[PDB]
Every structure is written in structure tokens, then in C-alpha cells.
Amino acid sequence: CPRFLKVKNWETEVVLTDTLHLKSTLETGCTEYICMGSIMHPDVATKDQLFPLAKEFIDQYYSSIKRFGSKAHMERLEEVNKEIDTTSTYQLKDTELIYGAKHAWRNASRCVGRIQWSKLQVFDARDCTTAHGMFNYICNHVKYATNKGNLRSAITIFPQRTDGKHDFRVWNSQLIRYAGYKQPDGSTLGDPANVQFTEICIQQGWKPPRGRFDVLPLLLQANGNDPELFQIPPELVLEVPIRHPKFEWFKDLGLKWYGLPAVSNMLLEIGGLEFSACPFSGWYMGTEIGVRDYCDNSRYNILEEVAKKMNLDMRKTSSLWKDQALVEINIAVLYSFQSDKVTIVDHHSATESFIKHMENEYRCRGGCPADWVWIVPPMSGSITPVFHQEMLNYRLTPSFEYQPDPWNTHVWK
Amino acid sequence: RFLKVKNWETEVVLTDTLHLKSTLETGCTEYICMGSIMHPSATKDQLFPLAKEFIDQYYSSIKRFGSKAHMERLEEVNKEIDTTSTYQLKDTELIYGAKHAWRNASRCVGRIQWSKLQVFDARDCTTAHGMFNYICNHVKYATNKGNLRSAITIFPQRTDGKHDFRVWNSQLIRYAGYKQPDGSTLGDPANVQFTEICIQQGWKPPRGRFDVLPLLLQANGNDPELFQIPPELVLEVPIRHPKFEWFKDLGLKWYGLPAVSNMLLEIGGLEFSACPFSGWYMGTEIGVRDYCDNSRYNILEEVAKKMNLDMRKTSSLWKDQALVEINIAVLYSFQSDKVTIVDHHSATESFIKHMENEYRCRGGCPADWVWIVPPMSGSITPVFHQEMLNYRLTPSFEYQPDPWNTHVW
Ligand code: HEM
Ligand code: HEM
Ligand SMILES: CNCCCc1cncc(CCc2cc(C)cc(N)n2)c1
Ligand SMILES: CNCCCc1cncc(CCc2cc(C)cc(N)n2)c1
Ligand SMILES: C[C@H](O)[C@H](O)[C@H]1CNc2nc(N)[nH]c(=O)c2N1
Ligand SMILES: C[C@H](O)[C@H](O)[C@H]1CNc2nc(N)[nH]c(=O)c2N1
Ligand SMILES: [Zn+2]
């Protein structure tokens, strides 16, 4: 591979120079002959696989603290090496765990919020032994992160994978999501995307309220056991009702959303160690809710209903009636979050901050991996700065990876 | 391997086999993806196997692979390369090659139309005056009084790189750009340099906002010469709004014929360095990019003003509101003037149907998601949710160096 790669901004003419890509550790899925850049998703490590991966991470940590080649550095290496040899695995120090989480976020190419990468409260839940404990740790996460509306980003890390038969898993893909109920007539109530999972909860014993916005319970798996259900205390789930600063009729749509965006289905990889349950959260960019959750056809799909109340011409598509209702819905989303003092950021602010982050990363780190397809907002794309920014995508470690859904793999005891 | 692509909205899965036929790099490796890089990085012995491959897929596509017709054509291309270091395409081959280069154009959302393309063979052109005549005919045919028609004019292939035919204009029709004394820019800022090359060549600029640039035509590696297209061939649209009567007072117009002239058409290892091609506009090209790009006409703030919007915080989404209205006006103007235009909803729908067509009859369709998704309202068009595989099939339209960075005067 070439040593220096250039990326250009076509709006501002700025050329940046990337050396970081040389440290690339995982495969992107692309080859010289084909590009999988728009593809969403393109029994444990042996002692001989683990040695190099650990050292790689440890060297990197001691590099970051300006102690590379130090006595403490070599002692730590020997300690890890002996531990992998005696026990087939090793344990991270707390300092190492905190560094790893922050760097997994820093490396997350699909994330536009990374200017905040170094400000992450890390909760070490590695002493957790049961689902009830997982629940306690998660409720504490939610309340801390929620902070009465002034959200703070956090990750809670449960015990690492051992033999693969003893995984900790949060079965929910996000900590806070709404239920979805298929009707006999074929229509859906709630969030249609969550029907499969809503059905799983009901099977496990959940009593469904069968409403439009029912917060799903947590389905929690400790130490490879069958998962158990818990209801998050309602008072811990901050919610915002959606209203419009001009249209008085918008509140009559009976829409609201949850304040805390928290991903619980991904795998944290640090020094070759696998943290299969590592829920993390930050704060929302408006378009996530206003464009995707609300306007995707497979989601709440409210464009039609909103276009009507707006008295828009809906016969030809070239009136752009769809577009005009999209903007208003996203105005209402940002307006309702700011008025209730819940932290939210619009797609203009967020993309602008990300350009500045990316540049500083090029200046200090020699690169900043980014997935344009995820980075560009799902509306008004070219009037945000990221649209015009060339990006290099590649996969540094530590990282957040995808993993199989647990209901596909769980062995019911 | 047989690769699969999923649409996440409809859950339709398609299976791509066609990708196995490609041999040109895309720029990515297993460890670095350059999916958002705009521009990622011949003799007898080089020229033949390519000639062969192209002749082979031609006779395969007309259902006579290994025919007597096929065999002689191969021997034909043999001797011709052996003795002239090149070869000339049959007419039928030229037409097939052009249509398929459009078909293989990953970045093009309009490809449902690929097989309806009027091919003007201009290979007997020898002078810039010649080229100009050919181009005027192209523009006039393709404009067609508003009922636009896809066309391509193909000039003589490269021979030795020293006698290249080149259209210096990157597009056949574009407005001028003037670097003002006070530091502002008049017209289209994208064109400031090219405009200045024209003025330096004798062009008398009217210094207006929307001045059609003259043609700068290079024939056979010679110095280029200026030609103004006759105004009655250049169809333009005044932009007005269906509800906002003040929008006409903005003073905006755009040309009707989108016609890319800076690209290289490659067929059978032959290089057509001058091959302007045109179709018809998708509304967002003008409403979003041309008008609202910060480094282009940059009209967002002005429009938002006339809309009396609150422009103090970005979170009022005032920019978004203005953008939607600008694109409504654009569609409405063209439509009202019986000039062919397509909205990003219609065009994306057509592209998804086209994709399904391709996978069913051809086994795939290379598509560049970064280019296919419109620059506004992305996820409320179907292509946002469509996984697409990108790879490079030939015949293709490629990029080439700007001529002013290579030509020896
Ligand atoms: C602090 C405020 C943050 C903001 C505003 C933000 C912004 C975003 C946005 C808009 C997305 C796209 C999500 C989607 O389309 O589904 C995203 C994805 C993502 N974020 Fe961030 N983010 C934040 C914090 C974090 C944190 C704390 C982490 C991890 C420690 C993180 C890691 C990721 C990852 C891994 C993805 C892609 C997830 C996937 O594949 O579904 N982000 N972020
Ligand atoms: C017939 C109606 C057509 C429509 C609606 C259409 C639509 C589009 C659009 C919106 C773009 C993006 C251009 C940009 O943003 O700069 C594009 C690009 C492109 N089109 Fe099409 N197009 C059409 C016809 C054609 C024809 C006739 C050809 C060739 C014979 C062609 C080949 C290409 C190529 C090579 C690109 C990429 C240009 C570049 O790399 O800058 N298209 N098309
Ligand atoms: C995988 N596609 C489905 C996404 C559904 C979904 C539903 N609720 C919340 C999120 C959160 C995504 C998300 C995560 C984080 C950490 C920050 C942020 N701004 N956004 C995602
Ligand atoms: C390279 N990025 C800037 C392009 C600017 C530019 C200015 N005028 C016309 C075009 C042509 C774009 C274009 C080309 C074709 C063939 C069809 C279509 N609908 N649109 C492009
Ligand atoms: C097919 C395509 O990869 C898919 O729709 C992607 C496009 N870009 C995205 N970008 C973000 N932020 N989130 C998404 O879910 C997607 N989906
Ligand atoms: C950086 C990125 O490649 C560049 O901004 C691209 C993005 N997508 C595009 N898509 C289209 N249709 N036209 C363009 O000029 C661009 N520009
Ligand atoms: Zn790629």
C-alpha cells in the first residue's frame, strides 16, 4: 500500500494527508475489483492468536502515555504474556479498559459525533455475575447518561467472552426502543422494525400494553444463561413529545420520542479481548428521529399524514410535497428537544463539528477513518460540509463490531 | 463468489454475478475503501487482447459467438493492429460500445434509458471548425425544442497522444465566471479559470451573471479555437415559483441541455478523447448543486431572506426550508416550459426498477451509491436503502486530464 494518501474537500479545496491507514487491522470487505462501501454488514481466540493482538494494543497504550519502551511497559507485556500462557486469556487494567473504550469510539468510522471521543464515562461492570446485576448496572447507566436532560456519553462494559458458551448479552439492539405489534389484518402498531423482538419478549412472558409507544423491557443474558426480562423504571426513561413552533396541529399527531440513544448490540474489541455486551450512549442528531424513525416507510411512516395536515398538493411527486413535510417534521423534532432542555444537535452543527474533528485528527493522529455513506445526513445532504469531503474508510482496533443476534445463536438450557 | 445486495426498506435481495467480468481496479483494497474519492488512482501487444474481449462480448450480445462473422472480424483486427498499431470500429460496434459505456456508468442514475441513445459518428472530423459543426448539430438534435433526447457525438480516437481531439469545455453549455476587483465573483465561480482562458483567447465577455461560454475546440492535437454557439440553439429556462411571486424577481435562469464533454470514452482499447454526451436534467443538479453549493451560485441566504425566515440559529433549519422551495420552482419552471426534467423521486424509482431489470437479465448493475443518492432528501428516495455493488465494466466513460495542463501551444 502507498504510504501517504490524499483526501480533498471539493468545497474548500483543502487537501489532507493520511498516514494512519497503514495501521489498518481488519478487512473492509472491498477488494481491488469491487467496492462494498454501501453494504451495511459486509469458538474463541487461541493463545497463539492472542499474543500478538495483546502486545499490539499494549504497545499502543504505552505509546499514548509517553512511556513506550519503559520499564513499566515491558513489565506489563511480560505480565500479559505469562497470563495468556497460564490462563489462555488476560485481564485489562482499568486504565487500559478506559483507553480502549474511548479509542473504539475514536475509531468508529460510521460515527459523526466523535469530536467528543475523549469525554466518555466508562462503567466497569466486569464483576457482574447475573442478569439482575446487569439490570442494576444498566439502570445506573441510563440515569447517569440521561442526567435530567443534559445528556452525558457513557459505556458500561460487562464481562468479556471466555469460551463462547458463557457470553453476556443485551438482547435489545438499543436500550430504549418502542414495541411493534403485527395485527391479523396485516397492519402494524408501534415501531414495525421491532415486531420480531417484541414477539420474543411476549413469548418470554412480557405483558404487552399494545400501544403506539411502549418502551420495551430489557432482555438480559448473563454468563451464557437464558435471558431474563426486566422493566426499566418509567421515571428513568426521559421522553420528549413532538410539537411544532408554528403549526398548532402538530401536537395532535400524538408523537413523542425517547431522549437517550444507546446501542447495546455491538461487540467491543480491545487487545484481542471480546466484550460481547457493552452498551454505549451519547446524544441524538435530529435527523435520526425526524428523517429515519419518523419517515422511513418501514418505520412510523408519517409523511402522508403530515402532508395532509399541511394542505400540500400530493398528486405529482414534483410538487416535492414529501420534501416539504420532511423539513417541518425535523424542525418540530429539534424544537421539542430544545424546549424541554434535552440535549440534541442538528445536522448542520454536527457535520460542521465533525469536519473540524477530522482535520485535527489528520493534524495530530495522521488520519481519521470515516464512512461517507453513514456520515452524510439522510436529508439536505449537499448543504452540509461532509458531502463535499473526501473520506478514507478503514478499520482500526480497538473497535465496535457487529455480532450475531443472540436469539439466532442462544442454546436454550 | 456470488454476491448479494439487500434493499433494507423492501427486503428484496438480488444476486450479483456480473462483477466477475471486470478487470479494471476500483481503487479500494481489502483494508482501505476509497468509495468517496472523486478521482481514485497503448501498443500492439496491449491493444489486441482488449480488442478481442470487446469483439467477443459484441458477438456474444448479438447471439453469434464463434460465427464466421466473428472469426473474420478477429483476423481483421489482427492485421490492422499489426500494421497500423491501432484499428477502426465498425459502425454497429461503435453504437454498441457507446450504449454500453452509458450502461456501465456507475455514477449515473439515468440508466433506465441506456439503450435509447442517438449516436453521431464524427470520426471523419479533421478540424475545430468541423467539430463545432458536429457539436451544433448535436445540441440542436438533442435539445429538440424542449423534448430532449439522449445523444453522443464521437470524434476521432487517440493515435499517439500528440494529435488528440479535445473539447476544452468540461460541459457543452455553462455560464461564465468573473473574478471581481472587490473580491466577489460574478456568475458561476466554478468556471472562473476557464472563462479567463476564453477571454485570454479573444472572447469578449458581457460580464453578466448568465453568459453562455463559447466553445473551445481542439482538433488533432492542434491549438484550440473559439466558437460561439448560435443563441437559438441554446435553450434556457427562467426560474419562477408557483406560489412565491417574488421568486421571478431573483433573476435566475439555467440552460436546458446537460452535456458532458470532458470525458474519455474507451471501447476495445480505443480512446475517444472527444465524445460529448447529453441527456436531460434531474432537478436537484440545478436546485441543490448549481444554485446552493457554497462554491457555486450560493443563493440560499438570498432566498431565505425573501422567505422571511429566522436565520440566527442553524437549528431552525432555515437552509433546508429554502432549499426545498428552490427545487420546487426549478421543476415547475421546466415543466411549465415543456422542457424535459425529472424529479429526484421519479428518477430514483426508475433507477431501482432499472437495477432489478439488470440483475434479472444481466446478473448485476454496478452502481455508485455516493453518486446515485440525490444531494437532498436522501433517505426518502428508494436508492438510499438500496445496497449497491460498485465495479468497473468496459466500455466505460473515464476521466482525463484537463487539456490546459498538458497542451504544448
Ligand atoms: C455523544 C453524542 C453522539 C452523537 C451526536 C453521535 C452521532 C451519531 C450518529 C448520528 C450516528 C448514526 C446512527 C444511525 O444512523 O443509526 C452514530 C452512529 C454510531 N456511533 Fe455515534 N454519536 C454519539 C456518541 C457515540 C458514542 C458515545 C459512541 C461509542 C462509545 C458512538 C459510537 C457509534 C457507533 C459505533 C455508530 C454506528 C452504529 C451502527 O453501526 O449502527 N457514538 N453516531
Ligand atoms: C437521459 C437522461 C439522464 C439522466 C436523467 C441522467 C442523470 C444523471 C445525474 C443526475 C448525474 C450526476 C451528474 C453530476 O452530479 O455531476 C449523472 C451522471 C453521469 N451520467 Fe447520466 N443522466 C442521463 C443521461 C446520460 C447519458 C446519455 C450518458 C452517456 C451517454 C450518461 C452518462 C453519465 C456519466 C458518465 C455520469 C458521471 C459523470 C461524472 O463522472 O461527472 N448519462 N447522470
Ligand atoms: C441499525 N439501524 C437501526 C437504528 C435504530 C436506532 C434506534 N434508536 C436509537 C439508535 C441510536 C443510534 C445512535 C447511537 C449513539 C451512541 C448516538 C447516536 N446519536 N445515535 C438507533
Ligand atoms: C463535475 N461536477 C460538476 C458538474 C457541473 C455540471 C454543469 N453542467 C452540466 C453538467 C452535466 C451533468 C449531467 C450530465 C448528463 C449526461 C446528464 C445529466 N442529467 N446531467 C454538470
Ligand atoms: C444501503 C445503505 O448502505 C443503507 O441504507 C445505509 C445508508 N446510509 C446510512 N447512514 C446512516 N447514518 N444510517 C443508516 O442506517 C444508513 N443506512
Ligand atoms: C466527496 C464526494 O465524493 C463528492 O462530494 C461527491 C459526493 N456525491 C456526489 N454525487 C453526485 N451526483 N455528484 C457529485 O458531484 C458528487 N460529489
Ligand atoms: Zn470500497
All three cell numbers of A331, joined, read 424542525
* Beta partners for residue A7, in sequence order: A16
Mark whether A33 and A90 lie in a shared domain.
Answer: yes
The residue contributing the CA closest to ligand 5 atom 15 is A374
* Beta partners for residue A109, in sequence order: none
Cα-based distances in Å from A158 to A106, A117, A216, A265: 20, 20, 21, 12
For residue B37, give the ligand nearest its CA: 6
Q: How many residues does chain B have?
A: 409
Q: Is A171 among the catalytic positions?
A: no
Q: What is the DSSP string of A24-72?
A: --S--S--SS-B-TT-S------HHHHHHHHHHHHHHHHHHTT-TT-HH
> Cα(B316)–Cα(B29) distance, rounded to whole angstroms?
42
The total number of structural domains in chain B stands at 3
Provide the resolution (angstroms): 2.2
Q: Is A128 among the catalytic positions?
A: no
The one-character DSSP state at A138 is H
Mark whether B45 and B156 lie in a shared domain.
Answer: yes
A319: in domain? yes
Task: Give the number of other CB atoms < 10 A from CB of residue A214.
Answer: 20
| Sign of the CA dihedral with A389 first, then A395, A396, and A399 last | positive
B280 is in an annotated binding site: yes
B9: in domain? no
User: Any residues with CB less than 8 A from the CB of A177 and at least 6 apart, and which?
Assistant: A191, A194, A197, A215, A216
Name every chain A residue with its beta carbon within 8 A of the beta carbon of B381.
none
* Beta partners for residue A29, in sequence order: none
A-B CB pairs within 8 A amount to 209
B310: in domain? yes
> Cα(A337)–Cα(A344) distance, rounded to whole angstroms?
6
Mark whether B38 and B155 lie in a shared domain.
Answer: yes
Q: List the end-to-end C-alpha distance of chain A, in Å, as a whole number.
A: 49
Closest CA to B349 of B383, B384, B387, B324: B383
Q: Is A239 among the catalytic positions?
A: no
- Is residue B17 within 8 A of residue B2, CB to CB? The reply is yes
A35 and B389 within 8 Å at the Cβ level: the answer is: yes
All three cell numbers of A400, joined, read 465496535
Q: What is the DSSP string of B236-286?
A: EEE---SS-TTGGGG--EEES--EE-S-EEEETTEEES---EE--EEHHII
Cα(B278) to centroid(ligand 4), Å: 9
- Is residue B165 within 8 A of residue B156, CB to CB? The reply is yes
Mark whether A366 and A324 lie in a shared domain.
Answer: no
B58 is in an annotated binding site: no
A320 and B332 within 8 Å at the Cβ level: the answer is: no
Mark whether A340 and A365 lie in a shared domain.
Answer: no
Which residue's C-alpha cell is 419478549?
A201
Whichever domain contains A173, its CATH number is 3.90.440.10
> Cα(A277)–Cα(A158) distance, rounded to whole angstroms?
6
B139: in domain? yes
> Cα(A135)–Cα(A228) distance, rounded to whole angstroms?
10
Task: Give the number of other CB atoms < 10 A from CB of residue B45.
Answer: 8
Whichever domain contains A326, its CATH number is 3.90.1230.10
B376 and A393 within 8 Å at the Cβ level: the answer is: no
B317 and A298 within 8 Å at the Cβ level: the answer is: no
All three cell numbers of A161, joined, read 467472552
Which residue's C-alpha cell is 501551444?
B409
Domain range for B353 is 16-123+150-160+264-278+348-372
B292: in domain? yes
Task: Give the number of other CB atoms < 10 A from CB of residue A229.
Answer: 17
User: Any residues with CB less than 8 A from the CB of B385 and at least 6 apart, and which?
Assistant: A296, B7, B8, B9, B10, B379
The beta strand positions in A72-203, using DSSP E, are: 121-124, 154-157, 169-170, 180-182, 188-190
Closest CA to A138 of A91, A114, A172: A172
> Cα(B104)–Cα(B111) distance, rounded to whole angstroms?
9
Q: Kindly list the catalytic residues of B.
A: 108, 111, 280, 285
> Cα(B151)–Cα(B260) distance, rounded to whole angstroms?
11
Could you give phi then psi for residue B239, rounded to 5 degrees?
-90, 120
What is residue A279's three-state secondary structure?
coil
Mark whether A342 and A229 lie in a shared domain.
Answer: no
Mark whether B82 and B172 lie in a shared domain.
Answer: no
User: Does residue B321 sit at the A interface (CB-CB below 8 Å)?
Assistant: yes
Mark whether A28 and A132 lie in a shared domain.
Answer: no
User: Any residues with CB less than 8 A from the CB of B401 and at least 6 apart, and which?
Assistant: none
Breaks (C-N over 2.5 A) in chain A follow: 42
> Cα(A338)–Cα(A52) distance, rounded to whole angstroms?
48
> Cα(A144)–Cα(A387) distance, rounded to whole angstroms?
34
Closest CA to B56 of B65, B48, B46, B68: B65
- Which of B331, B346, B361 is the endpoint of a domain? B346
> Cα(A226)–Cα(A159) distance, rounded to whole angstroms?
16
Please name the residues between 300 and 319 in chain B that touch chain A, using a CB distance below 8 Å. 300, 314-317, 319
User: Any residues with CB less than 8 A from the CB of A79 and at least 6 apart, and which?
Assistant: none
Q: Is residue B193 within a helix (H) or strand (E), and if so which, with residue range?
A: helix B192-201
All three cell numbers of B406, joined, read 498538458
Mark whether B342 and B250 lie in a shared domain.
Answer: yes
> Cα(B377)–Cα(A382) distance, rounded to whole angstroms?
10
Task: Give the number of other CB atoms < 10 A from CB of residue A282.
Answer: 24
Mark whether A207 and A222 lie in a shared domain.
Answer: yes
The per-residue b/e assignment along A43-82, b for 16 or more CB within 10 angstroms, e otherwise, is eebeeeebbebbbebbebbbeeeeeeeeeebeebeeebbe
A380: in domain? no
Q: Is A96 among the catalytic positions?
A: no
Give helix B318-336 / helix A321-339 axis angle, nearest 10°. 170
Q: Which experimental method was this entry solved with? A: X-ray
Residues A71, A76, A80: CA angle, nearest 5 degrees: 155
The one-character DSSP state at A257 is E
Cα(B188) to centroid(ligand 4), Å: 14
What pairing do the DSSP bridges indicate for beta strands B185-187 and A267-270? unpaired
- Is residue A177 within 8 A of residue A195, CB to CB? The reply is no
> Cα(A116)–Cα(A412) distance, rounded to whole angstroms?
40
A397: in domain? no
A35 and B36 within 8 Å at the Cβ level: the answer is: no
Task: Write the burial class of residue B179 (CB in 10 Å: 0-12 exposed, 13-18 middle, 19+ buried).
Answer: middle
Closest CA to A109 of A186, A25, A179, A185: A25
> Cα(A84)–Cα(A47) distance, rounded to whole angstroms?
6
Whichever domain contains A96, its CATH number is 3.90.340.10
Residue type, B386: Q
Q: How many residues does chain A have?
A: 413
Mark whether B67 and B169 lie in a shared domain.
Answer: no
Please name the residues between 269 and 298 in chain A that touch chain B, using a CB distance below 8 Å. 286, 291-292, 295-298
A5: in domain? no
Residue tagged active-site, from A283, A295, A328, A361: A283
- Is residue B367 within 8 A of residue B390, CB to CB? The reply is yes
Mark whether B48 and B155 lie in a shared domain.
Answer: yes
